[PDB]
């Protein structure tokens, strides 16, 4: 149950039923610029995994610039509902 499996509801689905199975877990990107703010929901597969020992994807050192509060997580659906504002 879940873990391994990862619903993870993403921007791009559309008709994958607005969410898509992953191997690895969940990862929105949050990277709210002055260009806009870039909120993206994905399914991160487990060869999305960067590095594959633990996507630093999701701890970039965000210092002040960019606001990238990047989701990472191994509960289903929990993409978009993750760590509230973790750089």
């Known amino acids: 149950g879940s873990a391994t499996a990862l619903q993870c509801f993403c921007h791009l689905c559309t008709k994958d039923n607005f969410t898509c ?5 969940c990862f929105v990107s949050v990277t709210e610029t002055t260009d806009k703010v870039i909120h993206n929901s994905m399914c991160i597969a487990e060869i999305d995994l960067i590095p ?5 994807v999701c701890a970039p050192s965000s210092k002040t610039g960019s606001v990238t509060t990047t989701y990472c997580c191994n509960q289903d659906h929990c993409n978009k509902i993750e760590l509230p504002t973790t750089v």
Do not use: C, Q, S
Not at 21 to 25: A, N, S
């Open 21 to 25: 199975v992953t191997d690895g877990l």
């Open 52 to 56: 594959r020992d633990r996507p630093f």
